[PDB]
Design an enzyme around this catalytic site. Structure first.
Site, PDB file in Angstrom:
ATOM      1  N   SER A  32       0.842  -1.195   0.000  1.00 48.38           N
ATOM      2  CA  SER A  32       0.000   0.000   0.000  1.00 48.38           C
ATOM      3  C   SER A  32       0.876   1.243   0.000  1.00 48.38           C
ATOM      4  O   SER A  32       0.952   1.949  -1.004  1.00 48.38           O
ATOM      5  CB  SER A  32      -0.936   0.010   1.210  1.00 48.38           C
ATOM      6  OG  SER A  32      -1.760  -1.147   1.223  1.00 48.38           O
ATOM      7  N   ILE A  56       3.829   4.472   6.244  1.00 50.74           N
ATOM      8  CA  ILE A  56       3.434   4.285   7.649  1.00 50.74           C
ATOM      9  C   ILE A  56       4.151   5.337   8.509  1.00 50.74           C
ATOM     10  O   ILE A  56       3.713   5.669   9.618  1.00 50.74           O
ATOM     11  CB  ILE A  56       3.757   2.850   8.205  1.00 50.74           C
ATOM     12  CG1 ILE A  56       5.213   2.745   8.692  1.00 50.74           C
ATOM     13  CG2 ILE A  56       3.415   1.772   7.164  1.00 50.74           C
ATOM     14  CD1 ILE A  56       5.406   2.017  10.033  1.00 50.74           C
ATOM     15  N   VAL A  80       9.840   5.193  11.487  1.00 45.22           N
ATOM     16  CA  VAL A  80       9.882   6.099  12.626  1.00 45.22           C
ATOM     17  C   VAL A  80      10.296   7.474  12.076  1.00 45.22           C
ATOM     18  O   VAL A  80       9.432   8.276  11.736  1.00 45.22           O
ATOM     19  CB  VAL A  80      10.793   5.583  13.784  1.00 45.22           C
ATOM     20  CG1 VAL A  80      10.099   4.427  14.519  1.00 45.22           C
ATOM     21  CG2 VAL A  80      12.162   5.130  13.276  1.00 45.22           C
ATOM     22  N   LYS A 109      28.412   5.132   8.917  1.00 45.62           N
ATOM     23  CA  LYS A 109      28.220   4.961  10.355  1.00 45.62           C
ATOM     24  C   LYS A 109      29.404   4.175  10.915  1.00 45.62           C
ATOM     25  O   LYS A 109      29.537   2.984  10.627  1.00 45.62           O
ATOM     26  CB  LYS A 109      26.903   4.220  10.642  1.00 45.62           C
ATOM     27  CG  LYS A 109      26.572   3.989  12.134  1.00 45.62           C
ATOM     28  CD  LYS A 109      25.435   2.982  12.271  1.00 45.62           C
ATOM     29  CE  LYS A 109      25.124   2.625  13.710  1.00 45.62           C
ATOM     30  NZ  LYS A 109      26.386   2.449  14.448  1.00 45.62           N
ATOM     31  N   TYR A 135      23.774 -16.926  18.869  1.00 39.90           N
ATOM     32  CA  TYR A 135      24.007 -15.793  17.979  1.00 39.90           C
ATOM     33  C   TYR A 135      22.905 -14.738  18.101  1.00 39.90           C
ATOM     34  O   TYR A 135      21.714 -15.052  17.994  1.00 39.90           O
ATOM     35  CB  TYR A 135      24.090 -16.248  16.519  1.00 39.90           C
ATOM     36  CG  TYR A 135      24.280 -15.059  15.599  1.00 39.90           C
ATOM     37  CD1 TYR A 135      25.508 -14.407  15.530  1.00 39.90           C
ATOM     38  CD2 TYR A 135      23.232 -14.572  14.816  1.00 39.90           C
ATOM     39  CE1 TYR A 135      25.690 -13.303  14.711  1.00 39.90           C
ATOM     40  CE2 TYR A 135      23.412 -13.467  13.976  1.00 39.90           C
ATOM     41  CZ  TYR A 135      24.646 -12.845  13.930  1.00 39.90           C
ATOM     42  OH  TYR A 135      24.836 -11.756  13.113  1.00 39.90           O
TER      43      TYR A 135
END
Length: 509
Positions: free
Chosen positions: A35, A38, A41, A74, A452
């Protein structure tokens, strides 16, 4: 079996399609129905050093995908004000050196040159301090134990390597841009792309999924269904009624407010790292992107109101965040009991979720699709494939949760009710026992969660040494061993790091 229906797009859905395709090519038939939006975040998202295997598995080199997703480097997580207000330190992606049988951090506790364990023990910490790139301008990666021009296993996946050799970094990028990039990757290799919604999950007489019903594209049928509907859990949790297991009692952060600006006021956005700055009721993230910086406040609503969180965030980012859109969301913290049920596999937020404190989200997905390929079923649907799969991903999530709990248990600050409660909340019984071990002997291969879960002992060491709330002791044997070799190891690191400081370009440049 080779008909796969993936329900849900975004990062989970399209990492699944692109990874299945890279692994099986023309022998797997995939249709993904999505779709849209959302919010995830925030705009930005971050990854582990593991992610390297993903892109290489796809045959994607950095130059092909990083510009398209506004990706930056990073080199660590920078934790600020978790110990005390002046203080920060790194959780880097760099192997932990050892000397005559003991980790350098053990030596550090005994005879460390400075009061900064990470600067003493990690080449990466200075590189980051100077806002430096991990690559020379010609493109040669920083001289480190990892020979990039070296022989590796063909089709090398993260869950048998398990950080055995150390690639020196991960990435920050725009998550929706990666989904769009992989969408293209996947569709070029024959994945069928349907934008529509699911009205109905059709079950058979045994409760197995026969197909999903869309608004305009009819019924989508297949052998195996991948639930990438996120917190919705439309297939796994709703149709199939798989129970959720909450982590909330041990990690109470249940809410987040997010936003973006072109640049950060303290310029955390220049740094080649992701920053987690502790607050009164949680912590704020900073994720550097090429032409923008994504920021957010992860907090516990019982301690702080949504309005308060947003105001704190805006002030923290400064005058550039005065007026921009802010997005609030609530988080489902925990995991499905079993991420594979009958002929359904949940991957992504539908399988589980923790606060992005160590940005494990993409990692959870990467591990999941690898395990899916590994334990892929044949038409006898031997239940053992499922059991192995579920064992593998539950361990990963449970292990990481323990690791995240430690962040708050070890944090020395105690100046708000929230930070006081981190020392009194319920913890996994296993964790308390391990903490007793660590007080005497730094995190060892044998004294961490034994299955793990993506985190080597040195990650645990970094959190312990950095948060400074747990008293730590060097191994008695160090008092009897010659400290010379260790001092020469510290010295080699310092020399490398002052050479490197001179010749590496800045991050943004």
């Amino acid at each position: 079996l080779n008909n796969v229906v993936i329900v849900g797009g975004g990062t989970a859905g399209w990492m699944t399609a692109s990874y299945l395709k890279a692994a099986f090519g023309d022998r797997i038939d995939i249709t993904l129905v999505e779709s849209g939006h959302i919010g995830a975040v925030g705009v930005g998202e971050a990854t582990f050093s593991d992610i390297r295997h993903f892109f290489e598995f796809l045959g994607l080199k950095e130059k092909d995908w990083m510009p398209a997703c506004n990706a930056t480097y990073k080199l660590a997580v920078r934790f600020e004000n978790w110990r005390e207000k002046g203080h920060y330190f790194y959780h880097p992606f760099e192997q932990m050196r050892s000397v005559n049988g003991f980790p350098l951090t053990d030596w550090w506790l005994k005879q460390g040159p400075t009061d900064r364990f990470d600067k003493d023990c990690f080449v990466m910490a200075s590189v980051i301090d100077a806002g430096l790139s991990p690559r020379h301008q010609d493109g040669t990666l920083i001289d480190q134990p990892f020979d990039e021009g070296a022989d590796e296993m063909q089709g090398l996946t993260m869950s048998e390597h398990q950080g055995k050799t150390q690639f020196p970094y991960a990435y920050q990028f725009e998550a929706a841009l990666l989904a769009k990039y992989l969408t293209k990757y996947s569709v070029e290799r024959g994945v069928k792309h349907i934008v529509d919604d699911v009205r109905e999950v059709s079950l058979d007489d045994r409760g197995w999924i026969t197909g999903v019903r869309t608004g305009e594209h009819g019924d989508l049928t297949g052998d195996l269904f991948i639930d990438c509907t996120g917190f919705r859990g439309l297939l796994l949790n709703q149709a199939l009624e798989e129970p959720f297991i909450s982590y909330q009692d041990t990690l109470p952060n249940d809410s987040a407010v997010a936003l973006q600006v072109p640049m950060d006021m303290e310029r955390r956005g220049i740094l080649p790292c992701t920053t987690a700055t502790a607050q009164d009721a949680g912590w704020i993230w900073t994720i550097p992107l090429t032409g923008r910086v994504g920021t957010g406040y992860v907090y516990a609503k019982d301690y702080l109101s949504p309005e308060e969180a947003e105001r704190t965030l805006r002030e923290f980012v400064g005058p550039a965040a005065a007026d921009v859109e802010a997005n609030h969301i609530r988080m489902r913290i925990g995991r499905s009991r079993n991420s594979w049920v009958k002929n359904c596999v949940a991957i992504g937020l539908s399988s589980g979720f923790v606060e992005p404190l160590e940005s494990t989200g993409i990692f959870f997905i990467h591990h999941a699709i690898e395990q899916l390929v590994k334990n892929f079923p044949a038409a006898d649907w031997n239940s053992m494939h499922r059991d192995l799969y579920n064992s593998a991903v539950s361990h990963v999530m449970d292990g990481v949760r323990e690791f995240l709990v430690l962040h708050y248990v070890a944090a020395k600050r105690n100046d708000t009710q929230y930070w006081r409660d981190t020392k009194t909340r319920k913890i996994p019984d296993s964790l308390a026992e391990r903490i007793e071990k660590w007080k005497v002997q730094l995190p060892d291969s044998e004294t961490v969660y034994p299955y793990y879960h993506g985190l080597p002992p040195y990650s645990y060491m970094c959190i312990l040494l950095g948060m400074g709330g747990i008293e730590l002791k060097p191994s008695p044997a160090l008092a009897l061993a010659d400290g010379g070799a260790a001092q020469r190891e510290f010295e080699q690191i310092r020399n490398k790091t002052q050479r490197l400081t001179e010749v590496l370009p800045k991050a943004y440049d």
